[PDB]
Amino acid sequence: GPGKPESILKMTKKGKTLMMFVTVSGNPTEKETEEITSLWQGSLFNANYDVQRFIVGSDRAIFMLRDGSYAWEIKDFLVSQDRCAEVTLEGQMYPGK
């Protein structure tokens, strides 16, 4: 919600491609993976954002964000929906962990 790191996206700006690796563990298998990957990255493209989102493993998902203006709202959805496990942003020292 309000604790989304606005600092990094507005300070970097110019549409910096930030890849985000998400660990997801409501299901300690690929079930949360599948749930999240298909529903989210399906809607991640359905809401026409310019991103690449991947099935990267059992209890591992990604949303590779590009426009520099939408990732941490998505982060809020994650931990409201994947049960709530782990978000890892790309870059050095994220002030919103």
Q: How many domains does the chain have?
A: 1
**Alpha carbon of 59 to those of 55, 68, 93: distances in Å?**
9, 25, 24
Structure-determination technique: NMR
Quick check: 25 and 32 in contact, CB under 8 A? Answer: yes
SS3 sequence, the chain? CCCCCHHHHHHHCCCCCEEEEEECCCCCCHHHHHHHHHHHHHHHHHCCCCEECCEEECCEEEEEECCCCCHHHHHHHHHHHCCCCEEECCCCCCCCC
Closest CA to 16 of 53, 73, 62, 65: 65
Domain containing residue 61: 1-97
| CATH number, domain containing residue 35 | 3.30.70.260
Spatial CB neighbours of 93, under 8 Å, sequence gap ≥ 6: none
Measured between alpha carbons, how far is 80 from 42 in angstroms, rounded to an integer?
18
